[PDB]
Design a protein around this ligand. Structure first.
Ligand code: NA
Lengths: 307, 307, 307, 307, 307
């Protein structure tokens, strides 16, 4: 039951895909396992690069196929090489770029935390066991992470385990358990850009929406909410042309609905004030010290949406 | 007439394409069939991975080509292996990601139900018979399906059948019938996002459109419908920048037309009111208890478009 | 001079590209031609699948290369196989997906009819003759064509012909004439979506543009055309975000220009009315029974553009 | 020093890329050169298609690698064949689709003329000489060029020359001079669509911007320029959503800035008029026969931007 | 310990990717190293092109794999050849297009300077030493750089160095030090287009935002800021539909927030003026010689953001 050591060097985790829940990882993979010794030219280890590797497979060098369980579509494999040792051992080393899948909740957008994950397990072998797992995260904690879109939390986390496949066919004598390296990397989004360029102007617009009550007329008050309406939709356009498409409602997404709400609320008050009289055209006018009373009817409903 | 068992493991069904009617399926495929027995090294079954398989084909290992009938463009095949059994049997196992085609009606959007389908049939063989078909849907019912765009209904459904090709050339003695495994998976769209961030604000706008009749003037009434007009078109922009391009009119699509209609209706009434007199500038004013009479002339025409 | 029968099974014609004039075709191709007879194992015909075919070419099986003349870029070839008959004949069968080119006039958009075309001709041979051509269009006339973007007219049309290449070099004794199968398939666009969600609302906007004359003031009349202006541009934004980019002006495209026109016309009248007086501020007021006189100055100019 | 004749058949030049300066060319290439004579089966020349060619290379048929100097990324090569003549000569023929690079000035947009170019030079040889160059442009002058995006000027132009590479290493005895065929094709853009659907409406908007001065009030005048402002930006959105991204300012791009200018000009006049008095609220009113005086202050600054 | 000379010919550096920090490089690479001498046919050096090279590898020609350390995904390799010298030496020459990664700060947008970088280091070898590095930048200083998006600074910079890998396994006797050629090319963005078509009109809008104080009424003043608001958002849409998506805030990005600010400021003043009285409706009116006093409260806060 063969011992395989694995080391994995992660270069970039880049190109997240909000819709498909997908990221890209460029790096190298190394596997070492000891075999029946070999004469090498010199007595120095042998280097077998790229096209040459498949030649030795044809002369019966077993090299096991390790699968990226969670990869989406066969990865771009770079240079590969075998290092063949005289005293048996074999070291396989390749560069790769691959697209990987994990679960990603984006619901608390710009303020999401995420988890980039690798899953390695051999493609046809269960005795054949992943010995130890190492993970060298080139990219450091605080290089200059305010140029990069994500801030990585800790260092790489590991965990080798055993996976049981129930439904597998022609085997019974306890042989359905495969060795699986799992690598996690935690991260948080760089909530800058979205504050300064989304959250803030959305708020200014929301605020200045409320200054409708400081209009004197009723005709004035009613007519410029329709402009405020248009202003939200305009801003909705803007968000949409920038933000990552999703199938759920982000934080920003709600803020936007709050806008649509406050303004439709206003239209209700504003028309109510005018026809809540005894006479005829007595504007309630006492309502409009909701002037700065329903801004904090909103900061009330806005400090509620933090639970 | 050869017996082939098939097992198909579906990992994700992702990336639907509304326009092309097309989805992506990542998973593995397995085929097992028993041949004339063989000496394996040890007496343990043989593993033949990737490049090595095509070598055994050259020494006459038949391995039949099974075609994904409904795939659009040759699929990304990952690791493949042959497991060669001493007592004859052969088990072929590959990982794949492929783009598939089925019919998809999107007409009742955000509220559509769909059917993701696989079709497997051997590429050159009719005796040669798909024995039994299995389908292991990793993804469970209620994992956390409100992160995922779609909620899958039941478990996978099957159906092995026989397909007769009429127009096939140089054969007559009853040999035009091929074995075809067909897999279906039912699903419904996660109608959240579209309610909360589309149907709802469209409604608020439609509503507040109606508050035009609560304007005192006529000049007031006529002029702010043009702003309401602009507001629909603005919102039409927004839907368009988010929603899946189609060649028919979805539910949302109609709502948007209703907006355009209510507002063009308004312009008709509002101008009719002013010149339906018999003096000169007697505003009908009794019409404008359509104030909250043609909102439910719309909720009438809106409860009609469900049947 | 070799007889080659061809059959072509078309699965989907999808993914049209208005700019590049390009469509996608998924289907199978078959070629049969009879050779000098052969011993087949059994006396039943031989099946040679995929990788194995190129092996037989190396031992001198001629298999002719047939070219898709009008394809843009080498097509995605699926499974292929040779069926080798004992009595000589050979049947070549492959599945393919390829992007093809034909001339496409889009000028009368949503209402365009088109012609999807295949052109097959052998790549190096002129004696060597395409015997007969067959075309099985799986997709029927009225399946449910109102889910699909196009409605196909008839059945597939054929035509085998002879092509003469003038400028070809080292041959003169009358040998510049190649055999070419041509397949056509007619189609019309599903003019639905564009009526209901473009032609119509554009019309409503165009109409309600005209209700500017029913404004009392002059200041009223001039000021809200600027809003009508904005409304056309807003709608132009909308069409652009949805419709297929082209290098000519479609029907819809013109409608939009008509909008820009009627509104600029209005600004001319409206300003003329005010300063076509005798006194000073006598609004012509008789002009403004162009109220519902230049809507049918437009339906006049609109029933003219049906050439 | 080997004589190689080259013929190049151009099928489509399509898919221009304004940003990257890049077009696509689908066509065939032919090369003929005479070698030491050969026994062909029959005495008729030999046809070697596709996979078979590389076989002859391994038995020492030299076939030279000709490079597309100005291609971006290795091109899609279709069917290739060698025609092997008994009397020595060899004719290489392949179909190709490749993306090419040339310098492209887009500064005078919709009215740009361009030059589609091919550059062929052998990859490792300088004795080895391109004999003569031929270029058959299938696509004729006036087929129906008003469906196509570009109108090609002349016929294809040629030029075989000699290229000297200074910095090349291990050679000195005058051997740094390589044979290079260069093909040019001139073309002009189909300036239709952009006149009718961009230049014109931009003008109408620009014009109707000027009708601000025919407003009576000052408050009227100032307020509806802000709507005119919005109108330009609205139209800037529209251009952007349609026009090819570039890193310089096209003609249209300037027109748009003219708009922003005229309207910002207006705001200056309009506010100047009101406060350039000999009292308090005396509107200069004589200025506002810039009514139709600064439209031709613009047609003055607009006939300046042509030379 | 083998001496390898390298020459690198850069053709285009194009297609930058702001998000991913990524550019494309098309060019050629050359490596020369001297081996144990060889009989060449003739006594003239041997040319081994493309497919043929891998043949010589199989007969034991070492050719070392050199890695592009900083490339994102395996590059498109074009023609390759070996030139085999009788007196030992070997010259390897290939054409390539590759996507490369470097750190890119975009914070001072349109006015960013950048650094295009190549990193070459052998894939399995440390004795084996990069002799000297040469870099021929075809593209000159002032060709016509105002058609191109970037202006390159100097000429190519070099630097061969030694890299120590700490974590490498089965070696200790001082053998973890690899030879690495590093190429830099400096560049600045063509800040034209963004001045003329972004910075400028944003300024005009910003300016003309200030002409709100030259409105007489209060109702006038408050209502047309909402239109100014809309105007910023409209312009924000425009920038977003054109500019490169980033995860930080560019210069233009801030300007846009300034706009939102000045306009929200205005709304504060404008409402303050009206209700900062002694009496009731005394407009402060003395404030509104902030008319042209807070434009330079902004040019004050705008000359502060140059640090
Ligand atoms: Na857009």
């Amino acid at each position: 039951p063969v011992d395989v050591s694995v080391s994995i060097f992660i270069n970039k985790i880049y190109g997240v895909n909000t819709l498909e829940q997908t990221y890209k990882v460029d790096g190298y993979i190394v596997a070492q396992w000891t075999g029946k010794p070999r004469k090498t030219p010199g007595d120095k280890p042998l280097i077998v690069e790229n096209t040459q590797i498949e030649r030795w497979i044809n002369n019966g060098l077993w090299v096991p196929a390790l699968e990226f369980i969670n990869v989406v579509g066969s990865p771009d494999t770079g240079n590969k090489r075998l290092m063949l040792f005289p005293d048996g051992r074999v070291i396989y080393n390749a560069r790769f770029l691959g697209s990987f899948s994990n679960d990603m909740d984006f619901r608390l957008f710009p303020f999401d935390r995420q988890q980039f994950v690798l899953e390695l397990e051999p493609f046809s072998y269960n005795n054949q066991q992943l010995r130890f797992s190492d993970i060298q995260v080139y990219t450091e904690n605080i290089d200059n992470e305010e140029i990069d879109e994500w801030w990585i939390r800790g260092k790489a986390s590991t965990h080798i385990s055993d996976i049981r496949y129930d439904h597998l066919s022609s085997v019974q004598p306890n042989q359905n358990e495969f060795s699986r390296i799992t690598v996690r990397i935690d991260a948080v989004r760089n909530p800058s850009y979205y504050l300064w360029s989304f959250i803030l102007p959305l708020g200014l617009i929301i605020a200045a929406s409320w200054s409708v009550f400081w209009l004197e007329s009723f005709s004035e008050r009613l007519q410029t909410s329709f402009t405020l309406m248009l202003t939200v939709v305009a801003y909705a356009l803007y968000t949409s042309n920038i933000l990552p498409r999703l199938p759920y409602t982000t934080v920003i997404d709600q803020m936007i609905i709050a806008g649509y709400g406050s303004i439709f609320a206003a239209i209700l008050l504003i028309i109510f004030a005018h026809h809540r009289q005894a006479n005829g055209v007595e504007d309630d006018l006492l309502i409009q010290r909701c002037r700065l009373a329903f801004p904090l009817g909103f900061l009330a409903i806005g400090c509620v949406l933090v639970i």
